[PDB]
């Protein structure tokens, strides 16, 4: 569907014996909207849950380099007198430094709207692939019409850097957004923490300390206010564990957590407060179950030790012989078991062998029952949310099958080694990185799969609940008994929100011709016998003629393991001397344009005397010499580029070819680039409504039908000998 929202393609596919992968294609028409087009796929049996992706449709050409706009810190302290110092790192796609000129502007993102700071516009040089600029503090206060520093907190800062090459043949706009203005470099979150505690037990605060953009913090000491001895440290997952002691009385626990970073003042420490309620026993019978898991982070294959601990009177003891444990993973029961508890054991330990089907997290729900406590049946439960380290269920690694001591060349056969599960179907793509320069979002990653899974779980609250029915409801369970104890009513699908020398004819140059923006759309099967469960496939791919970095992304799809998105493998293709033909996207017919051939020379010591040549194409008009081809001799200094201009007047509509061949004097090399460009006539794409009609067969027409005659299009400003597309839309008007 288009950015208007109407579906322009509808397809019915079946994934039967395809091993879960459905490849599809769609040709974009030339008469087309521009913007964020969307793909919406859904299952037939569940036609209201829609899985969507987005792709931009835009008229572009591929850039030759990337621009990274990195501020020195990922936030902005409002009392920092040095301002916001950012660094512009312009790097070529084949891994070379960029000499150029950056125009850097700043602005305040205030919610959904943004305002610029026009006095903050700076023009800086970029030498050796880097440049530095500082937005001053006083420019930021006088740019904002509101007074004081304190109202800038909450609003974000964005920086747009537009980098011009020194030849001027290419520019890249890159925007770094979402730099918040904060009074504290950290943020305290209680989201992985239970909101319910057992009174008389330790309460394990699982405090999530974050950077203010949303990234997890690391090695940040936090402490409960009033309990200075409990000073923990933030681990690599961003969350620190603080086990405090709770008094045995039914009161709400007010927990205030502050950071204890040594290099900040007391006003820069992030605090947050939580009211945690006590677990409610039935009949205030003082029977609690405590579920102690001494966890930091778990790889699969290791083990943890669940500590069941009873808290009840001895007059009813030796009536508890087991604790039932259940594992909830991905919204369904993974493993249910009993743990035998001999009488006299206040604490028992159950070893959970964390296998690979515990990814991404699980909920250990445990309970027991007791009949003779006060004459009626009593169910006492607990639950804990344990986070496994999120990885693939199987594995998929794409790397170089060859030695890769050499740098690859355009057209060179390259050996790709794919290591995965046995029998998995591996699908691949190899994408030019300038596509990721233009549009970076909506990429398939493994973490996106696990947050799709993590947002579709049925457990609401981590840890315990209000009572046993609260524990089972927040875990995502219904417990029902014959006596009458049951979980409360769940009826909502979501969780509730809380001249001569012809050097070009002598060297028989075949031209670099294939420049795809994406290739290697291949389907492979790992049918090799596995070595320790890993099948290795070698592939002989042929590299395309673009001088860039190809990003190769492979997804393995296995019957016993599942979907694993690999890490992207980067193949950098680069020569020492080459041609970059900087054609535009489209050229208006019968107008004069100038195109650029940027010859790059990357020798460390020697300059190059390069004979360059535009081949004569009869579709373009150019200068007609006695020799029909147009050649000259340039000199390129070492580690540098030179832009050669060519003026052409195109005369024919369509995909015309431009060929530039160059050969180095006194050296046995050459290059040649043949690229096609679109030549459009002089008009402008402009839509015109043929009709809007209301269909009603019982009110309009006769005999139960209604005949509507679509007229032909009444365009009089149309360009002659050009294509037009008439779009028909029928829509069902809802009635109430």
């Amino acid at each position: 569907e288009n950015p208007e929202g109407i579906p322009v393609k509808q397809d019915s596919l079946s994934s039967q014996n395809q091993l879960g992968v459905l490849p599809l294609s769609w040709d974009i028409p030339e008469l087309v909207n521009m913007g964020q087009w969307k793909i919406r796929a859904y299952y037939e049996n569940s036609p209201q849950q829609v899985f969507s992706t987005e792709f931009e449709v835009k008229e572009y050409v591929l850039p030759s380099f990337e621009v990274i706009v990195e501020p020195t810190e990922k936030f902005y302290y409002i009392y920092n007198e040095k301002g916001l110092e950012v660094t512009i790192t312009a790097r070529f796609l084949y891994g070379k430094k960029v000499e150029g000129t950056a125009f850097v502007i700043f602005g305040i993102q205030d919610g959904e709207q943004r305002i610029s700071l026009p006095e903050s516009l700076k023009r800086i040089p970029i030498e050796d692939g880097s440049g530095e600029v500082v937005l001053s503090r006083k420019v930021l206060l006088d740019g904002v019409q509101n007074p004081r520093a304190e109202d800038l907190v909450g609003k974000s800062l964005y920086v747009s850097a537009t980098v011009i090459l020194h030849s001027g043949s290419d520019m890249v706009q890159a925007e770094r957004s979402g730099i918040p203005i904060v009074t504290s470099p950290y943020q305290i979150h209680f989201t992985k923490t239970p909101k319910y505690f057992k009174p008389g037990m330790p309460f394990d605060l699982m405090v999530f300390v974050t950077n203010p953009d949303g990234s997890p913090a690391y090695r940040v000491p936090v402490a409960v206010q009033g309990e200075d001895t409990v000073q923990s440290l933030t681990q690599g997952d961003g969350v620190a564990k603080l086990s405090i002691n709770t008094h045995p009385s039914q009161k709400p626990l007010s927990i205030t957590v502050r950071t204890k970073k040594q290099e900040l003042s007391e006003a820069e420490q992030a605090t947050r407060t939580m009211q945690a309620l006590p677990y409610s026993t039935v009949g205030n019978s003082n029977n609690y179950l405590h579920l102690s898991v001494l966890r930091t982070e778990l790889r699969p294959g290791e083990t943890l030790n669940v500590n069941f601990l009873l808290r009840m009177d001895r007059a009813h003891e030796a009536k508890i012989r087991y604790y039932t444990y259940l594992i909830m993973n991905k919204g369904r029961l993974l493993k249910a078991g009993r743990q035998v508890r001999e009488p006299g054991q206040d604490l028992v330990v159950l070893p959970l062998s964390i296998t690979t089907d515990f990814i991404p997290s699980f909920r250990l729900v445990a309970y027991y029952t007791l009949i003779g406590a006060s004459g009626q049946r009593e169910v006492v439960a607990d639950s804990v949310w344990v986070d496994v380290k999120d990885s693939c269920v199987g594995s998929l690694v794409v790397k170089s099958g060859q030695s890769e001591d050499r740098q690859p060349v355009p057209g060179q056969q390259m050996t790709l080694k794919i290591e995965g599960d046995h029998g998995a179907r591996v699908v691949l793509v190899a994408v030019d990185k300038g596509v990721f320069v233009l549009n970076k979002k909506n990429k398939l990653t493994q973490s996106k799969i696990w947050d799709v899974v993590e947002k579709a779980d049925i457990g609401c609250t981590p840890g315990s609940g209000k009572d046993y029915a609260g524990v089972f409801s927040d875990a995502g369970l219904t417990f029902t008994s014959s006596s009458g104890q049951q979980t409360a009513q769940r009826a909502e699908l979501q969780c509730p929100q809380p001249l001569d020398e012809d050097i070009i004819a002598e060297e028989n140059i075949v031209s670099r011709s294939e420049f795809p923006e994406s290739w290697l759309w291949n389907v492979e099967d790992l049918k090799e016998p596995p070595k320790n469960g890993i099948s290795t496939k070698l592939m002989n791919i042929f590299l395309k003629d673009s001088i860039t970095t190809w990003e190769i992304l492979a997804v393995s799809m296995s019957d016993k393991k599942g979907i694993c998105v690999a890490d992207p493998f980067e193949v950098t293709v680069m020569q020492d001397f080459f041609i970059d033909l900087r054609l535009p996207y489209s050229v208006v017919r019968n107008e004069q344009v100038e195109i650029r051939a940027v010859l790059y020379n990357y020798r460390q010591n020697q300059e190059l005397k390069v004979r360059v040549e535009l081949l004569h194409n009869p579709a373009f008009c150019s200068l007609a010499t006695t020799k029909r081809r147009h050649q000259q001799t340039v000199t390129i200094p070492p580690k540098s580029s030179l832009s050669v201009p060519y003026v052409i007047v195109p005369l024919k509509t369509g995909l015309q070819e431009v060929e530039v061949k160059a050969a180095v004097y006194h050296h046995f090399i050459s290059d040649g680039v043949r690229k096609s460009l679109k030549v459009v006539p002089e008009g402008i794409r402009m839509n015109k409504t043929v009709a809007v009609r209301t269909l009603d067969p019982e009110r309009l027409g006769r005999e139960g039908v209604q005949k509507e005659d679509i007229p032909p299009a009444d365009l009089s400003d149309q360009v002659p000998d050009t294509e037009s597309e008439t779009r028909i839309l029928l829509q069902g008007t809802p009635v109430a």
């Epitope: 050097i503 002598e506 050296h667 046995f668």
Partner: nanobody, 123 residues
């Protein structure tokens, strides 16, 4: 990487002719330059000839200009050097070398080398 052998050396009379064969194990079609380098007894390993990827560009040294001819055949990866009108100062060990085309008249970029044939012209 390639393996590179040379065949066709030996005893040659003065004013005669010689033909050799530089045989490459692998693919010749990605090698920008191959050259013939001779080595006199008691002297350097200096440049004699080199040929382009397409065979359209030849470079010879100054002493060998009107008398030597280098050819390349990419069908079966074979580079041939032909002498007419031998002088007795061409008594040398001849090696064939593969390089990436950068400065093809110097040996410092020819990465892959052979073992060479002894060519003795008698006067």
């Amino acid at each position: 990487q390639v393996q590179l052998v040379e065949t066709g050396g030996g005893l040659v009379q003065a004013g005669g002719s010689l033909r050799l064969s530089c045989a490459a194990s692998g693919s010749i079609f990605s090698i920008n330059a191959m050259g013939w380098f001779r080595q006199a007894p008691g002297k350097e390993r200096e440049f004699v000839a080199t040929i382009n990827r397409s065979g359209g560009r030849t470079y010879y040294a100054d002493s060998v200009k009107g008398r030597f001819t280098i050819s390349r055949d990419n069908g079966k990866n074979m580079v041939y050097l032909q002498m007419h009108s031998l002088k007795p100062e061409d008594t040398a060990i001849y090696y064939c070398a593969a390089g990436t085309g950068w400065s093809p008249q110097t040996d410092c970029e020819y990465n892959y080398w052979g073992q060479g044939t002894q060519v003795t012209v008698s006067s």
